[PDB]
Amino acid sequence: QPEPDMITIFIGTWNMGNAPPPKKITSWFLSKGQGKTRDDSADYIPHDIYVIGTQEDPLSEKEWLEILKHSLQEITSVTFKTVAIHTLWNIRIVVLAKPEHENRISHICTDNVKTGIANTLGNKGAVGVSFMFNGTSLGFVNSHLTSGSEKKLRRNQNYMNILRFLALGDKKLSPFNITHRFTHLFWFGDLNYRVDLPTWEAETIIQKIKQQQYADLLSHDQLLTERREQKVFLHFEEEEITFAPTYRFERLTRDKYAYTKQKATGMKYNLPSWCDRVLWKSYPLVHVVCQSYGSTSDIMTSDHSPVFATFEAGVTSQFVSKNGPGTVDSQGQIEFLRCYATLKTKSQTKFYLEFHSSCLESFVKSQEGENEEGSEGELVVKFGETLPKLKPIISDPEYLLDQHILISIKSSDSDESYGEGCIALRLEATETQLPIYTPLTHHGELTGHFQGEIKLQTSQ
Numbered sequence: 538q539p540e541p542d543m544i545t546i547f548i549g550t551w552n553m554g555n556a557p558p559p560k561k562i563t564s565w566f567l568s569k570g571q572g573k574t575r576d577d578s579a580d581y582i583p584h585d586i587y588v589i590g591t592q593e594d595p596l597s598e599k600e601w602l603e604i605l606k607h608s609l610q611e612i613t614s615v616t617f618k619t620v621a622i623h624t625l626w627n628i629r630i631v632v633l634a635k636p637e638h639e640n641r642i643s644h645i646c647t648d649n650v651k652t653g654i655a656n657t658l659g660n661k662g663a664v665g666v667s668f669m670f671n672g673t674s675l676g677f678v679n680s681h682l683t684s685g686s687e688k689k690l691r692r693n694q695n696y697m698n699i700l701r702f703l704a705l706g707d708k709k710l711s712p713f714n715i716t717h718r719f720t721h722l723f724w725f726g727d728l729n730y731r732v733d734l735p736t737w738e739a740e741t742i743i744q745k746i747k748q749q750q751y752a753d754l755l756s757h758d759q760l761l762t763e764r765r766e767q768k769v770f771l772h773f774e775e776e777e778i779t780f781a782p783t784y785r786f787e788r789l790t791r792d793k794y795a796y797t798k799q800k801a802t803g804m805k806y807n808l809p810s811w812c813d814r815v816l817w818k819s820y821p822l823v824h825v826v827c828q829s830y831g832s833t834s835d836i837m838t839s840d841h842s843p844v845f846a847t848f849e850a851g852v853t854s855q856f857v858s859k860n861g862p863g864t865v866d867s868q869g870q871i872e873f874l875r876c877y878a879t880l881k882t883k884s885q886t887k888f889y890l891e892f893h894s895s896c897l898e899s900f901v902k903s904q905e906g907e908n909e910e911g912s913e914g915e916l917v918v919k920f921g922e923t924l925p926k927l928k929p930i931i932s933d934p935e936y937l938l939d940q941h942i943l944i945s946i947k948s949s950d951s952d953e954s955y956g957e958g959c960i961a962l963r964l965e966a967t968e969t970q971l972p973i974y975t976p977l978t979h980h981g982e983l984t985g986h987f988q989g990e991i992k993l994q995t996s997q
């Protein structure tokens with residue numbers, strides 16, 4: 538039975554409003570309702586992996602797992618296996634997989650991050666899961682960020698704390714946060730970004746929503762505008778939103794948005810908003826395609842509607858050769874030539890690189906670079922042809938061209954990373970000098986660039 542080179546992944550996010558779900562929630566897992574929806578002809582085809590994020594979830598883990606598994610069994614006639622479940626307060630993630638994948642999944646990690654201090658610590662944060670699916674690392678984050686139209690900056694801060702402190706994936710990737718540890722990272726939840734229009738415009742916004750005219754609302758969505766200004770979710774993707782705002786509804790119908798200030802809201806307005814979102818970040822030149830992104834119309838127990846997204850995701854096999862794993866294959870080499878980092882830092886330490894990849898036996902430290910001044914004020918660190926030749930474990934081009942090199946530039950004085958990035962080995966040619974590029978980030982914010990040329994030798 539052949540190992541897959543593609544899987545499909547379902548991502549759900551639902552803020553349950555502290556209420557038990559209705560009897561039937563199958564529309565969620567079927568990607569049916571508003572937005573980019575799934576074709577009826579696929580309804581019996583199971584996704585390979587289902588990842589369910591809830592917020593304000595009132596159920597026990599046992600109670601929710603019985604509902605989820607019985608829902609999927611009814612849709613697909615498949616009894617899913619539980620990969621992982623993790624709950625922080627009322628924020629939960631469940632990962633379910635088809636039984637045929639049980640042998641393919643390993644290295645399962647879970648973690649959480651509590652956001653805020655004192656006042657602001659006690660209910661917001663994130664939970665996450667990671668695992669290996671054959672040769673492909675997968676990460677999932679469900680976050681419930683700070684509420685309130687006025688608190689977009691707090692939400693951005695919550696995002697940076699979560700990516701800094703959530704400990705998922707391979708701990709040997711010490712310089713790298715979750716935004717570099719995974720082939721595919723999905724980040725979803727009640728992100729709580731709002732449509733930033735005046736309170737007086739509430740009824741006008743509702744009118745627009747009834748006409749299905751979302752353009753002048755989306756132009757004011759705080760997540761889209763903060764992303765466009767590079768304040769949050771740098772280098773993540775989101776499918777276009779084509780569904781109505783998913784918050785704040787009167788319960789037991791979807792006919793009414795309940796936006797007016799009440800004692801129960803702390804006297805805050807909740808204008809209709811796309812609080813509930815799915816974003817992703819995949820390594821360069823890996824197949825990832827969003828095949829649905831939408832909200833259900835028939836699950837009405839909460840003041841939010843559930844959101845679904847589905848993806849095709851490229852995966853690779855657990856490769857064995859006569860040589861690696863367990864040794865190098867000397868018919869393989871990676872050379873980084875005429876490379877230089879451009880850094881936004883004002884420090885004047887010397888810098889070295891680290892190259893990390895599961896195609897290497899262990900990470901490789903470079904010699905220090907040569908620092909020069911950039912013409913517009915910046916530090917340029919030149920590496921020349923000084924960089925160590927990387928010795929992959931397997932030389933077969935069917936393996937090596939699917940790999941990635943993580944790069945960290947580190948201070949010689951402190952050993953702290955000043956920037957992290959990723960280079961694909963999915964080259965147009967082998968045995969040929971080709972341009973390479975990655976932005977460099979630290980704590981998820983842009984700190985520089987790394988560029989130069991690569992020369993890849995495979996056994997072919």
Ligand SMILES: Fc1cccc(CNCc2ccco2)c1
Pocket residue numbers: 618619620634638639640641642643
């Ligand atoms: F999908 C899953 C659901 C539950 C557990 C696991 C872990 N399976 C580990 C393993 C054994 C042999 C090869 O891989 C996977």
